[PDB]
Amino acid sequence: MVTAKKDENFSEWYTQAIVRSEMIEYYDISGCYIMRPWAFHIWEKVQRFFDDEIKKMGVENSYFPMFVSRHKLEKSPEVAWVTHYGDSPLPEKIAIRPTSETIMYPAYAKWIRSHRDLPLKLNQWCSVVRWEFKQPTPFLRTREFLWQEGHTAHATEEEAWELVLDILELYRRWYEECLAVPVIKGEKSEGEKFAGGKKTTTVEAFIPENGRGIQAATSHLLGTNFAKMFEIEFEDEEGHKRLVHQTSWGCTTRSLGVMIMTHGDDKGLVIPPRVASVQVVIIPILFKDENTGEILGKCRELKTMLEKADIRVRIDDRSNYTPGWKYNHWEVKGVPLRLELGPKDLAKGTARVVRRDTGEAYQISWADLAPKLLELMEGIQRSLFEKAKARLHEGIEKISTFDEVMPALNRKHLVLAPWCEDPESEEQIKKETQKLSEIQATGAMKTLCIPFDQPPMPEGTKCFYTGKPAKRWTLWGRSY
Amino acid sequence: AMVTAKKDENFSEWYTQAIVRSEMIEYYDISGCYIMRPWAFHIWEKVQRFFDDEIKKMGVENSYFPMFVSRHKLEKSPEVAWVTHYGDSPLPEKIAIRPTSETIMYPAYAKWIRSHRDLPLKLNQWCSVVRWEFKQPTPFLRTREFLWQEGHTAHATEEEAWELVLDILELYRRWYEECLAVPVIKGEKSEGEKFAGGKKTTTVEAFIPENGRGIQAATSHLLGTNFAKMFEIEFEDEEGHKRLVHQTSWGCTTRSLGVMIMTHGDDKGLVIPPRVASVQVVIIPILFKDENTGEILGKCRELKTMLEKADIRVRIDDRSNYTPGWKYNHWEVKGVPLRLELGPKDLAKGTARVVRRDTGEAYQISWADLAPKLLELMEGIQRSLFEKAKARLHEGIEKISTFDEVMPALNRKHLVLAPWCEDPESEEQIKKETQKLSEIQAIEMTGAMKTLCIPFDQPPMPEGTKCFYTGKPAKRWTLWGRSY
Numbered sequence A: 001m002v003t004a005k006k007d008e009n010f011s012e013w014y015t016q017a018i019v020r021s022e023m024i025e026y027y028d029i030s031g032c033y034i035m036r037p038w039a040f041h042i043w044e045k046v047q048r049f050f051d052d053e054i055k056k057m058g059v060e061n062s063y064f065p066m067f068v069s070r071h072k073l074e075k076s077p078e079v080a081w082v083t084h085y086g087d088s089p090l091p092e093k094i095a096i097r098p099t100s101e102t103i104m105y106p107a108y109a110k111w112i113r114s115h116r117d118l119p120l121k122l123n124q125w126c127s128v129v130r131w132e133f134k135q136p137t138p139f140l141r142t143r144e145f146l147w148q149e150g151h152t153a154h155a156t157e158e159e160a161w162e163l164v165l166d167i168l169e170l171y172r173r174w175y176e177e178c179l180a181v182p183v184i185k186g187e188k189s190e191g192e193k194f195a196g197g198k199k200t201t202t203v204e205a206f207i208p209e210n211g212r213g214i215q216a217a218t219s220h221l222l223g224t225n226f227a228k229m230f231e232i233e234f235e236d237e238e239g240h241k242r243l244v245h246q247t248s249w250g251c252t253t254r255s256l257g258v259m260i261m262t263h264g265d266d267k268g269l270v271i272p273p274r275v276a277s278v279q280v281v282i283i284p285i286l287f288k289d290e291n292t293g294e295i296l297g298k299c300r301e302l303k304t305m306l307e308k309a310d311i312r313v314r315i316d317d318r319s320n321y322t323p324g325w326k327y328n329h330w331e332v333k334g335v336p337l338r339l340e341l342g343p344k345d346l347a348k349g350t351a352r353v354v355r356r357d358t359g360e361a362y363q364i365s366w367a368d369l370a371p372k373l374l375e376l377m378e379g380i381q382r383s384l385f386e387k388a389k390a391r392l393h394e395g396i397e398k399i400s401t402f403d404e405v406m407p408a409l410n411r412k413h414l415v416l417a418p419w420c421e422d423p424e425s426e427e428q429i430k431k432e433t434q435k436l437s438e439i440q441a442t443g444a445m446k447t448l449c450i451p452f453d454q455p456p457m458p459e460g461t462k463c464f465y466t467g468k469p470a471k472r473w474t475l476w477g478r479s480y
Numbered sequence B: 001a002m003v004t005a006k007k008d009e010n011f012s013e014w015y016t017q018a019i020v021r022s023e024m025i026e027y028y029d030i031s032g033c034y035i036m037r038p039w040a041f042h043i044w045e046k047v048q049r050f051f052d053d054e055i056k057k058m059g060v061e062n063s064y065f066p067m068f069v070s071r072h073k074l075e076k077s078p079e080v081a082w083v084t085h086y087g088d089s090p091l092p093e094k095i096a097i098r099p100t101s102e103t104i105m106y107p108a109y110a111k112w113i114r115s116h117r118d119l120p121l122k123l124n125q126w127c128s129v130v131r132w133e134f135k136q137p138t139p140f141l142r143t144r145e146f147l148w149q150e151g152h153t154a155h156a157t158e159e160e161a162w163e164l165v166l167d168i169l170e171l172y173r174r175w176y177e178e179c180l181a182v183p184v185i186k187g188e189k190s191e192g193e194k195f196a197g198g199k200k201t202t203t204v205e206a207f208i209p210e211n212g213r214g215i216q217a218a219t220s221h222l223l224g225t226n227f228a229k230m231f232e233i234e235f236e237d238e239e240g241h242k243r244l245v246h247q248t249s250w251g252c253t254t255r256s257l258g259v260m261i262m263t264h265g266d267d268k269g270l271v272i273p274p275r276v277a278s279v280q281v282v283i284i285p286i287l288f289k290d291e292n293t294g295e296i297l298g299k300c301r302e303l304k305t306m307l308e309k310a311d312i313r314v315r316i317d318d319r320s321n322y323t324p325g326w327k328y329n330h331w332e333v334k335g336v337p338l339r340l341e342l343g344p345k346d347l348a349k350g351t352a353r354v355v356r357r358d359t360g361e362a363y364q365i366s367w368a369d370l371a372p373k374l375l376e377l378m379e380g381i382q383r384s385l386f387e388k389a390k391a392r393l394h395e396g397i398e399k400i401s402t403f404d405e406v407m408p409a410l411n412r413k414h415l416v417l418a419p420w421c422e423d424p425e426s427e428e429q430i431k432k433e434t435q436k437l438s439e440i441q442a443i444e445m446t447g448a449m450k451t452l453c454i455p456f457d458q459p460p461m462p463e464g465t466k467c468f469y470t471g472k473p474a475k476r477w478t479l480w481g482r483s484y
């Protein structure tokens, strides 16, 4: 049972939702959490979608070591260092991977020798470790987390940039098509991009209850800098030695946290049908032996028919729990549809179906069950996305001048503002907004992204902070 | 680009050449760790899909537990890797990288299990583990870091747990025999060889004829209640008394790829069974550089589309800057089970030439006949690969009566099946005796013979049969040999 209200104390609500639904368990090492099966099911679904999609692009999976030698990593950072095997010291300490550039690119330098070898497109599913001192949040910001990382090498910059954009569109689909979470595609600012690359692109999500943006996934154009550092070169069709043009990209189980925060309500989780391991739960109403074998035989009959429409169905015929307990259990876990079958329903040839997202109840004849449920699930998925998109739209304010910023931040909104893109000004804006928030008593505003979808920039439009010529419309807000 | 070491002359150099020249592995500067390149990883993906699909029907659910365990939870030093520092700062308590996840999972089991309604609890996880041994590593077979799955279940009764132990072991038999076409023997480990944390260890064992060695392929343990005692994993039963759960654990690793490589490979390189080959059919246009007109590649595309609508895994090697013969050798070293050749004559006849990797036999096939024919050939290659390997397994096991038969059989690079009293002291004695006799032989890996398993499939034990070593009453036929 969830008792905290989402719109009152959001942090207590989130903790309740993910504990009481059995998504997470705590662990004695700070910043690490156990991912229980109810959460892991969702990860498996988005992993299958993304993996299928990158394979059609020619990306192949691989597995590189979890350890990197001190002198290879440092070609200290907040990495976990292994210094001993048993009681014996290693002659050189080794780190646990925070990301695998230093592990993979020496191999790329060995494998790439001619244009015949390109493009090289690899991905791996693994976990990484970033041992930060700060407060962790389950799914969103943890010390160890699951994440794929893709790394590619190309003969030209244009082919690399094309892949960057293709991958970022896959991340838009991971969020919007699977998880029903709306995201904004954009470029990172110069101060916010990956330092080892040329251009970083991102999908950004918005959490209306605390007003914060959160980076959902990222796709980098690395250019040739790592090719220089690692000596990744190839002979072109005319004999000349050239540097490769690289990309890298990743997305994590943070996606699940964003889903939970987007669609959850006062009763617990709400799982979008496309990633629900159980789409429909059938609950036999058993009491005083009122037509028991009748009811359970019928439930089995219904499961088989729905499955023949590829609906993912679970009968909760466990005998150790009451029907009321089952209603609340599957509601807190977010199953899209609950189908109730009792003696009355069997006498009438119908089932009672309740939608998780809106609570609406439907009396459906057995014959109609499969097509109707399909309609409902399409309806649920679509409505989850559309409601979320409306909230995203209501949470962004277009502004012209800096004087509008603090009122907007106080409404827990993001701002879209014309910006000159000077890196000094982003540093100044972060400092000023933090100071102002402090005085009104994590308050800094930073750039979230420069969106791909740019409204026109009228000639003569001035930067909202510096008064210099504005270049592009930029999304700002408080953030994770 | 070609394998030159012969499998039956210098097996270790053959194995290294096969897995490097096929682009399955890459070396790494940290000893005992290797990079798993896509040609190998695809196979792992296929066996992972099979096993995952099968355990899900048993109600096992996947999960993910942390890779780290606190010093005081692991030591509830071992050969584990210890993290002692974040950046330059010491941890107040060092933490180990998981060598297996019992000490990470079972405290959560103790929290989750309170009543009989909570059972059975059935979890699995796919992850990597680390065992920092100082012995020489072998790619795929024995490494410091390896991918695996490990499953862990808890039950209200011993009979239910034992049923699951046996169901999982049958899945491991199918992983090897049905996916990888490797024959394995199901058996029970001896008291000295079982997992000390458990009551009974079952195994599937494989055999490598070229070096005469047995190798453990996968394992499934009946843990009993010992871990339930240690972690206080108890439940209130249907009548209200606290009871210990009965547990199982089981695991299988990428060692299964190394066993497959050693079982089917030949002097030309790898041979990949069709059921796990990421490319089942490579189409090689007989086309030379700057000669592409569109005729050959156009038909190659039409053929690939047709074959794919039969769910055949097809690749066209249309790479412009390699000759067709180079391509033939490339994909032979990689073990692609079927090569489809398409050149000018094939176009002029409406046929294609298909060559199977395992035997080299060639077939002329009409375009229209390709899809069913290739399906048939692949079923034939899989079956044949398995049936030849099973024959070698059978030729490699000698049934014996007395200890004096043992050294001759080991010198033929064979395993022995022998009646055994099952006394643990005698297995220690046999290991030492065979090691010393091997040493003396070698003057004029170790030579010790150990138990591999006590097979499930037991021939009758005639009344009065004596143990081949102690002369005491024999209990069960036991499989022994030199081992990994």
Ligand SMILES: Cc1cc(N2CC[C@@](C#N)(C3CC3)C2=O)cc(NC(=O)Cc2ccccc2)n1
Pocket (backbone or CB within 6 Å): A031, A130, A131, A132, A133, A134, A135, A136, A137, A139, A140, A141, A142, A143, A145, A147, A215, A216, A217, A218, A250, A251, A252, A253, A254
């Ligand atoms: C679960 C998760 C996710 C992510 N990040 C990063 C950006 C990214 C995106 N987009 C990655 C590129 C894919 C993402 O998801 C990052 C993290 N931990 C951390 O920062 C370390 C940490 C540990 C304890 C407290 C505070 C911080 N934890």
Ligand SMILES: Cc1cc(N2CC[C@@](C#N)(C3CC3)C2=O)cc(NC(=O)Cc2ccccc2)n1
Pocket (backbone or CB within 6 Å): B032, B131, B132, B133, B134, B135, B136, B137, B138, B140, B141, B142, B143, B144, B146, B148, B216, B217, B218, B219, B251, B252, B253, B254, B255
């Ligand atoms: C690749 C792989 C596999 C396996 N093992 C174990 C038994 C088992 C079986 N069956 C596991 C239960 C599943 C298996 O496969 C074990 C290993 N490394 C090691 O012993 C550590 C090591 C490191 C360097 C040199 C020598 C030894 N490396």
Ligand SMILES: O=C(C[C@H]1NCCC[C@@H]1O)Cn1cnc2cc(Br)c(Cl)cc2c1=O
Pocket (backbone or CB within 6 Å): A077, A078, A079, A098, A099, A100, A101, A130, A131, A148, A149, A150, A194, A218, A248, A249, A250
């Ligand atoms: O991890 C990255 C860059 C990219 N790597 C490939 C997957 C997508 C990802 O955005 C940035 N990054 C982030 N955090 C890090 C923390 C440490 Br500790 C180190 Cl050494 C290095 C890094 C580091 O390189």
Ligand SMILES: O=C(C[C@H]1NCCC[C@@H]1O)Cn1cnc2cc(Br)c(Cl)cc2c1=O
Pocket (backbone or CB within 6 Å): B078, B079, B080, B099, B100, B101, B102, B131, B132, B149, B150, B151, B195, B219, B249, B250, B251, B252
């Ligand atoms: O890892 C095991 C027992 C079982 N765990 C679950 C998967 C199947 C597997 O056989 C035995 N084992 C093997 N090697 C180990 C190495 C170290 Br180091 C430690 Cl601490 C512990 C162990 C250890 O417990």
